[PDB]
């Protein structure tokens, strides 16, 4: 039951999904919580930004194409979206627009999460996407032993310079206990949906396979290792928890974790 004191939170992308939508509603009514949520989009960042200030919205999620575009109209630049200069979140302190990026601190909570250890060896699949969040949240995470494995050359070649670690045109030689896959191999109705993000003589010598993809969540990747007993991180994992730190931003409470679940499979529907 809308009422004038009612906070409104967003989110703002050149092709809205539904998921932030029916997961944040769900949650507010389940807290008790006098916020609704919307996903909008705009052909001008310049004029939704001053707007969400503007208006009072208290918080607002950035996709594509406006993650670093935004940028320049934002108060304060946290250092999780510092650390890879994308900008994710933005949550509106009186006027004061704070910006974040709860991909980063999602990957940076499952590296903990899971206990990976920052001796193994680890090789990212991938230049694009998460790449970028991926690849400093394992150095900040204090992991050292890290390879990118690219098609894309020169960005490949970027990323590994960009944060002191190093680039690989082939898995030829390589062995690595922590295997990620941030390109799109997996993904449903891609062209590469029944392709495997790794070789399964690589899962097989490795001791952790996570997948950014999160549809499907058995990608024949994280099928594989599951195959062969190897732990799995999944990209619904991801897409969830960046999503219940955005919450917790915005409203000040951390739901539990029974109903983050509810919530997740309300919203997968």
Do not use: W
């Not at 996903?39 to 960042?45: E, K, L, M, V, Y």
């Not at 320049?72 to 009186?94: G, K, M």
């Not at 990118?148 to 020169?154: C, Q």
């Amino acid at each position: 039951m809308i009422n004038k004191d009612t906070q409104l939170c967003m989110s703002l992308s050149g092709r809205p999904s539904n998921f932030g939508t029916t997961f944040h509603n769900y949650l507010y009514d389940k807290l008790g919580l006098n916020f609704i949520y919307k996903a909008f989009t705009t052909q001008d960042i310049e004029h939704a930004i001053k707007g969400v200030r503007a208006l009072g919205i208290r918080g607002c999620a950035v996709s594509m194409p406006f993650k670093e575009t935004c940028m320049p109209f934002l108060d304060e630049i946290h250092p999780s979206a510092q650390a890879i200069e994308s900008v994710n979140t933005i949550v509106n302190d009186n006027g004061f627009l704070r910006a974040y990026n709860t991909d980063y601190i999602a990957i940076v909570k499952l590296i903990e999460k899971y206990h990976l250890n920052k001796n193994a060896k680890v090789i990212v699949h991938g230049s694009g996407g998460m790449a970028k969040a991926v690849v400093a949240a394992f150095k900040n995470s204090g992991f050292e032993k890290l390879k990118i494995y690219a098609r894309n050359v020169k960005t490949g070649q970027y990323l590994a310079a960009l944060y002191g670690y190093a680039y690989i045109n082939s898995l030829e030689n390589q062995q690595a206990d922590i295997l990620v896959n941030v390109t799109s191999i997996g993904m449903k109705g891609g062209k590469e949906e029944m392709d495997l993000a790794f070789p399964k003589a690589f899962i097989d010598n490795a001791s952790v396979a996570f997948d950014v993809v999160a549809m499907p969540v058995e990608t024949p990747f994280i099928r594989y290792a599951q195959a062969r007993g190897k732990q799995t991180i999944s990209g619904a994992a991801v897409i969830v928890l960046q999503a219940v730190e955005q919450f917790e931003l915005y409203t000040h409470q951390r739901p539990s974790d029974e109903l983050i679940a509810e919530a997740a499979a309300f919203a997968r529907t």
